[PDB]
Amino acid sequence: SFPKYKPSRLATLPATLDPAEYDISPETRKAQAERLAIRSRLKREYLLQYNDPNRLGVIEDPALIRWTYARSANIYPNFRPTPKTSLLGALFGIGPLFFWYYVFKTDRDKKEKLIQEGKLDQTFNISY
Amino acid sequence: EHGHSKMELPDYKQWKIEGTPLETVQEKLAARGLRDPWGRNEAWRYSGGFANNVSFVGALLKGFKWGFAAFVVAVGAEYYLESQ
Amino acid sequence: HTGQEMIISNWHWMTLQTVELSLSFKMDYFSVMFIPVALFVTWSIMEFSMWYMHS
Amino acid sequence: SDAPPLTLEAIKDRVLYVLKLYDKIDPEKLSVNSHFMKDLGLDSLDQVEIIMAMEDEFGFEIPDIDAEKLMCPQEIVDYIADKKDVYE
Amino acid sequence: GGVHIEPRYRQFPQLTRSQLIQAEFFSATMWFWILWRFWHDSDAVLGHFPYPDPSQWTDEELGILPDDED
Amino acid sequence: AFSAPAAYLTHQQKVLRLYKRALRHLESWCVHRDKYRYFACLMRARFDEHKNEKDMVKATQLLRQAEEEFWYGQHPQPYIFPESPGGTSYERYECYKVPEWCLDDWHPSEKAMYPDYFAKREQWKRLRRESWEREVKQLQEETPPGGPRTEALPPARKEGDLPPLWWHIVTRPRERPM
Amino acid sequence: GAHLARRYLGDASKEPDPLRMPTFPPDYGFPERKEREMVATQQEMNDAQLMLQQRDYCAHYLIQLLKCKRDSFPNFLACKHEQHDWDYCEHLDYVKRMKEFERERRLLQRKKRREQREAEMARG
Amino acid sequence: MLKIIIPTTMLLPMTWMSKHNMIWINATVHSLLISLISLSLLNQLGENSLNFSLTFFSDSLSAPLLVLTTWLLPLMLMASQSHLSKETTTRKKLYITMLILLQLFLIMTFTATELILFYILFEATLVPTLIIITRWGNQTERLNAGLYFLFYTLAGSLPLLVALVYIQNTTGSLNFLIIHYWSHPLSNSWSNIFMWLACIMAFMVKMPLYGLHLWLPKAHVEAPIAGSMVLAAVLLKLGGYGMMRITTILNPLTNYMAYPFLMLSMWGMIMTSSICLRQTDLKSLIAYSSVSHMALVIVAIMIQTPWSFMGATALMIAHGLTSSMLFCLANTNYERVHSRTMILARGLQTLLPLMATWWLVASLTNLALPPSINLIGELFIITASFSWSNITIILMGMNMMITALYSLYMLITTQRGKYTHHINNIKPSFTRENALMALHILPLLLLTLNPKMILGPLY
Amino acid sequence: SGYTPDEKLRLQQLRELRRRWLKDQELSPREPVLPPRRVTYRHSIFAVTHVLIPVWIIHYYLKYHVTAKPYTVVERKPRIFPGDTILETGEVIPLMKEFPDQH
């Protein structure tokens, strides 16, 4: 035996260490066959449109269109005001603003108090 | 101008394991009932101008002999010139 | 020989109220020592490149 | 670069050279079309070793899916020529 | 730019005498320079001024009184 | 690369892939040739010990410990051929690869130079224009109903036939276009 | 190191703090107390514009070294004697600093011995 | 000032009486001549201003914007020549009429000695842009975009009008000169707080402010190329010009009232720069980059120091030129590929090398590479902000880093890598497109030789 | 393992097509048909065009325009050592204090 490899989100499990590939059953082989069949049908359609001498443009990709549409225009109709969504929206959209406001307000209050007290030493400060 | 001179390959029968560390490897393997099949494919790396090796200190002292001779000649010349 | 040092403010670029910006070169020991070394290294590198990047 | 434009003949001689230095094959029984499994009586591990020898001798490596179905010296020569864009 | 040298295929490459003579000359030049500088200026490596021993300095020159005066 | 993939890898394919990968990483660890030869013979002897095993469940229990051991001792910086997918010149010359259709957009003054090349080019284009209309029918009649099951293409079976979908394989730019 | 080992692994008060040295009056040891001699004046040492950290009791030898380096320019091996003289004067300066360190350390030793002798007399 | 306004008006009869195949040539020639004429307003004074009459006056804040506005029309005509080729003569003439009307409204807006006249022309610009977007836009979303682009604006602009007339009932005048000379402090009161908000929000929504910026990606993605050019180059700068003009009567209430807008801008510039990193659309990416730059301009105007105003002027001019160039490059790609998706057409440096050089220069100037005027404005604003508070340097530096990141990401995605195999309709770039890019970029590198021309009245 | 007969045949046909294409990529002896139309010495001219002219322009510009303004070119005020004499005034800087010299 040897020390174990532990996968993570950003360092995934290697293919050759998966228990899944070594559990072969007829349903698994059938699923692999159908996956290869789908990929081969798509490849045949693409190459048929690709090798055509009469085609003179972009081969339109429905998968890319679906990707861009889902990323951009399908978000709001599928939005639902949810405790998770509401809390994350409020946090990520308001908390930074108030955090930065507090920081800058404290900094400028300290600076203003110092300049009123005269102990700031602003010599040679001509450009603002 | 390119190298079109019809280069021919040497004789494959020339490459042998004798006199090389591959011979020691074969002898050590034979003590376990094993044999190395690709030995003669590796023999050319120990055969010709690649046979002789130099050590690290020998490499660092690449031109120490000629430099030392020049140094002695120069110091002798300076000794015989200053003492005048 | 003598240690000659100069500042050359040749071209006056924009002036910002009391702040004046100009094209000025400092020709101190660091500049006059580093320029020949960098030029020598670049000369050797370019001569090497005419052989390395020929294709 | 200054790399000579290798030809089909040079590829063939180099492949046969590498095979003749393999002591599991007697050179006088070797041929350009000789099958590895049946004409030469070699195991699949031997074929993997031969593919790695070709990779180490030509400076490029053959993917397993292509390498596992190269059972003749002529097949290896053809694959190398097609990869390297060899004319004649 | 140079001369024509053919590939060799599992043998030692063809060597011109010019490169050998230049390499030997420059290696010998470096070694001669090192020896010449060591002979002429060895104190840059070994040091020139002795390092004094603090314990060797007597109390007389160091201003120490026998523990009772002050 | 050239050959089409299958639905799955068999057991002996997995064993041979592990053998190749282990030997490559071993020679990465064993820099010198004789040391590598010795340890490669040891590795081969270790592989062929279970060569005649008939219990497939026990054989699959094997190769799993073997791949775990490989991952433990896999030389985190293996040697890679320069043009291989991890090498130092893997995609170096892709910026010099230009498609063949770009020549259609050349100015007539540019095509005036190289007249023989362009004449051969229209020869090739006519060949493609006829062969394609034949190839579509050939592929249509040869393909099982319900679509292809494997992405493998048939050869030319008649006399004047050309292999279907041959154009973009035959007219690859080059390995070193410039 | 040896002094670092003594100070950090032994008694800290045994040996000086280099930041606070010296902690004793100059004439504490002997009453002659001659003062150091400076050869280069203010104005000439400013005109040479050496550096502020080069403006020490070794300045005049540096003036002569610079004078040679300027006068015999192409022969940059001409004046080696004044280089040796400036190095020797700096060596003497460092030796004096070492003597000051040793003297302060020995005074600390003797002061602690006087303190422990007074403690023993008080306890007796 | 009529020596510029009258030729712009004469552009309309000249357009409508032109031959069917002579509209572009004549419009381009006479627009370039009008730009040359307008170029003589750059001779400004260190004294008050160039007060031509009771109605129009010129300033060293107004003159660079006027020159940019005049220079933009010929480029818009060149860019619109291509996609409007299959169009009827009457509709091409109507498009050119919309462009000329927009230029006339902008020219009169920037001089406009009166605040009510400024408001009227500032809102008159809203109509031709709306028609251009909703009429000659390609997608079905253009109408929606127009709606947004309209109502947002009016949501801010109706309160301003009320405040404006209110001010004249108390002050007695809305002339900029009398307003400036007779300014009196604004007390810290609820009435004055709401007057301040009414005065500010109209220009704040048009920059746009980070919270109110949603209309901009819609309008830019949906508009035709000339619409995008004029939106990014000139129409966004109306808010900056208006804020600089009107903040003179809002003191000292600006010190307290500026905090929410300062926080919104300093955080939203980071937010929009990060948004640019994950964007599948070129036009949307360029729009978000514009939002970030205008956030920096808002910070500059709110800080309200001499260096802030100089940097804001320089950044407005530089961003106008750079964003117009970026939109033009993306449109040249779109007119070939018809997709507008960044990941689709790849490795274009191998197929179009000179256009790759144009892409590189535009990305470098968007990245604020010194001594470009983009960096001059950036650095002046950053220094003013540092004096305002030393902690702003964190957000400014993060914004600079993210800006470099998405600029080079956009360059590398489209120009580097391997070409897409199935795209075979990529033709060599036309002389018209190369000349368009050159006419965008050479003025920027010339302006870096004489920066005081674009540093405003506080120089 | 190995190639199926269909794979072998397709590879053979593709191979002969590819070799024909590659052979066709070669240029004939006249192929770059170029249309012509016109409308110590090398180093000497290089030194004149690339060193002498730029140094002339720069020296003229520095001597007559940049130094017309004050403080544009500022020097170092060279070091003065004891025993030196000044060209402008002619006076002699006094020496050192004749320090004790040994070794």
Ligand SMILES: CCCCCCCCCCCCCCCCC[C@@H](O)O[C@H](CO[C@H](O)CCCCCCCCCCCCCCC)COP(=O)(O)OCC[N+](C)(C)C
């Ligand atoms: C959405 C996308 C961006 C849009 C633009 C956003 C920017 C608008 C933000 C408005 C700026 C601030 C408004 C008022 C600032 C004055 C300071 C005051 O609010 O704070 C305290 C005031 O105390 C409390 O805040 C009283 C007001 C509480 C009621 C306001 C509702 C709070 C949250 C609502 C936010 C919704 C904004 C959008 C509306 C559609 C100060 O204490 P006090 O010394 O006593 O008052 C001094 C001022 N005096 C002298 C004139 C009286």
Ligand SMILES: CCCCCCCCCCCC(=O)SCCNC(=O)CCNC(=O)[C@H](O)C(C)(C)COP(=O)(O)O
């Ligand atoms: C340095 C990196 C670390 C690497 C360590 C890796 C571990 C090494 C030890 C591996 C353990 C095994 O043998 S894994 C044992 C797996 N099971 C079997 O081998 C049963 C039947 N064998 C086959 O079918 C083969 O293909 C064969 C017949 C050999 C060839 O076939 P050909 O006739 O088609 O050539």
